[PDB]
Subunit: 280 residues, 4 copies
């Protein structure tokens, strides 16, 4: 039934899960600040971490001394209404240890603070969905081993960058509004908070894009704690996540605040994008 | 400080506000169903209603007998993640009484069930914003007399209908992505839940559009309990809300589930849309 | 069926209930000072009060002329597992000064009174002179829900409630009475004993199950221990409003005219036949 | 500093704490049957239990062989303002049948025991044999927070706690003892009296402030009233673990070998010097 039961590293997880429960409370009501201390200090205790890498701290954190642990954590404690929390957990003495490619992830997940509090979590045997029962203070299994639709009917990106797109992006977006095979055009949706847009894609199917354009030549989304984790969820659900040249999980990170492009979603949909890319 | 203090008709209001507090709880966790009974039965008690008109009930409700009241209420108890609750209150023996134009609104507002619970409410002296303090169970004044930006930098619509647009819509959207005056193109955002998209516009400024296209010749949003209320908020904040031919508050409703187009947002922005409209 | 629905005194009340809600929250999680600060600041911004007497403040707080209104409020903001908030509302009658001579009205002038009990659930007993109404706080709502309209205490109970550890300091009446409860001379079963030692709790039980409650005078406390203004008047009022009795031993509590904001009195209250039994011991022994 | 962090018994515990959380919620808002159903269904799906004895169920519930595990659990799911949940965990030792002969171990075999108190706040007292730890439920977290590690009862208290309304049904020892509390023969001040009549509350107060608590045998209750299995063993265990004493009058409660799941015993527990005083009355009077 509940998250605590299912969930070593296991105690690094409920540690994280407790930061989420706490953040969520605070968010239902200075705030990016607070979220960070929570995620940092729950993780640092529990007694399982050795290297943390956060969006807010722009040096890596070495949890030192009386407590070091086998595992590395990368996270965005508060991301962005619909806010969220993203994280990826890696195995293995210093900063260079978060730079494992996404293929090295031991566990990753996100929290979505929307109408209800949702957690998508995976340790390598599919994605499970959990809602937070607030009259119980536990997460509860709502869906086991989710899987993304083969093909969606929703495309998701900021077409305010239309003027700055590469030509592949433009063609793809035009075949979504003007399909020439008879079919209906896709629907569009862009919340502009990354967890909300990523989560919608997992549950409803479709495609989500924050590609490179001329004002973000190497994209805009952080690789370590934003791109790698949702890429891991989506590929675990049987989707794709590409930077447009690689798979996202295969990029060898080179700096903790590295940026990469991001295209993810239903697999058929992402292959239609990769085909437009390749023509150019 | 709190909503209850500020808030006759006043008891029709806290009645509504209590349905919201209750809905919000339920939504943090069959559900459209439940929301409706709440809003209906709180309003019907309080002892202030005579005619209710809901999105879910497709006949009008005559609250009868031991209790009739001076006021008419139109609402969408649950609208759509980011869900919400929309309502408008009118003055004045039967169904024909909800059909007053939006100019007749005594009070209107919406609830937004997002990361936190937000209420935007107005009785004709501006828009006030309230957050729900959940360790208190009261709404709390966060912003008094909000006012929308003169001009925004965000345009909001579903460009999956691009192929079915009128030519004015197309031109406007092209001058938002390809401004020819030198300036930056607008940003795009479309959550696809109407309160979330409307609320963002009020707080951030810009424009929101669910116009007519070839598959919804008379638009898609319900006039009585969706268009009239947010039009009243936005015009109270000093914005505009037009169907593209009238102001929205000036349409004389002709059936409770009437549909109209909807364009609302920062005033400069809506006038730029009305100018594209008029050229065609 | 909600509290806020069923009602210048009206918003004074509302500020009080909001302050109760806030305190309930804080208790559930030095806390003395917070609750006190909640209540004072809530009441004062209701624009209804002119004089506030609090169990935590030595002197009576006078509301700045700016937010001054027509009511006096006396209250214990947090009074104590199980603790409570207690209040009495009087209307300012002398329009001299708003001084603390305005808090010193004898309790037959209570305009409205109440307590909140923070236990398993949060309950509110409230009377405005047409009987006692009880409310439970729904924390899925953030509101109080009415649960019994017009509660009436039992005419006679089967529980006595006092601290028998002051047995060696008892007057004769109190000694005689307790012994009749433990050893009846009428072939009935003894009363049962209950004493939480949080007055809101002991009084509330008394309302709901009936019986009697006593913190009477004794050798170490000749004028009694509980505070007249903002403990004994508010519950004497609730009880009398629910059809019971409340007495000092010699006089209805609500008839005692106060000489000092932190004045003490003996308290004996509950079901009318039990309080009468007690008074019989009192008269018998004073003669 | 959270409960879930600090730990097959481990998940049996977790199911119990989740069921406590759920009950806490429900109390705050027939409820007997719900709490019971929460606890039974939570424990059984921990895949840890084989025999469950509940205060609400006449017979001992045996876990379906499918989810069968190695633990016996005895519990009052809701025991009663202020009420509580109480549990004892024993490990199944005979591997015959899992019968209800498996619940009937004398309490020196408790593997872990605890109670939850639903009051102002929700508290959990929990011991697994290395002392008593206390937790408070943070409802902004949904978790329990540790608040005192290794609580130790006072060596001697100043409160006695029993129902003196059974005074006419007391044995001599209990009569002699109470009177020494109300009227000391050593020039000390009397103890104070407290008795909530919700055992989780009276016992918890006893732990936290020290003193003594008694529901001893009397003429209308010759074997006592409180239940050995899932009331008296769990608190005797907490108390003994916190450095106090718990006795039947004649024997450590934890040494009483049970003959029936709903068996009764006399309970006298608390600070060791007070319990000793009581035992002196007992021996003196039985001789």
């Amino acid at each position: 039934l509940t998250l605590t039961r299912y969930v070593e590293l296991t105690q690094l997880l409920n540690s994280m899960l407790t930061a989420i429960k706490a953040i969520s409370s605070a968010v239902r009501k200075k705030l990016d600040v607070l979220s960070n201390s929570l995620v940092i200090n729950m993780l640092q205790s529990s007694y399982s971490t050795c290297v943390l890498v956060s969006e807010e701290n722009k040096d890596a954190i070495i949890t030192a001394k009386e407590k070091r642990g086998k595992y590395v954590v990368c996270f965005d404690p508060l991301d962005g209404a619909s806010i969220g929390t993203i994280f990826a957990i890696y195995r293995k003495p210093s900063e260079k240890d978060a730079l494992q490619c996404g293929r090295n992830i031991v566990a990753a997940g996100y929290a979505l603070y929307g109408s209800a509090t949702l957690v998508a979590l995976s340790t390598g045997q599919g994605v499970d969905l959990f809602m937070l029962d607030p009259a119980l203070g536990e997460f509860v299994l709502v869906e086991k081993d989710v899987k993304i639709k083969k093909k969606g009917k929703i495309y998701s990106l900021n077409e305010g960058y239309a003027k700055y797109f590469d030509a592949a992006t433009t063609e793809y977006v035009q075949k979504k509004k003007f399909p020439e095979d008879g079919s209906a055009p896709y629907g569009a949706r862009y919340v502009g908070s990354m967890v909300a847009d990523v989560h919608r894609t997992l549950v409803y199917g479709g495609i989500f894009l924050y590609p490179a354009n001329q004002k973000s030549p190497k994209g805009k989304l952080r690789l370590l704690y934003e791109c790698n984790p949702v890429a891991y969820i989506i590929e675990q659900a049987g989707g794709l996540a590409t930077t447009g040249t690689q798979p996202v999980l295969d990029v060898k990170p080179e700096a903790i605040h590295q940026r990469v492009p991001l295209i993810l979603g239903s697999p058929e949909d992402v292959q239609e994008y990769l085909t437009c890319v390749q023509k150019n």
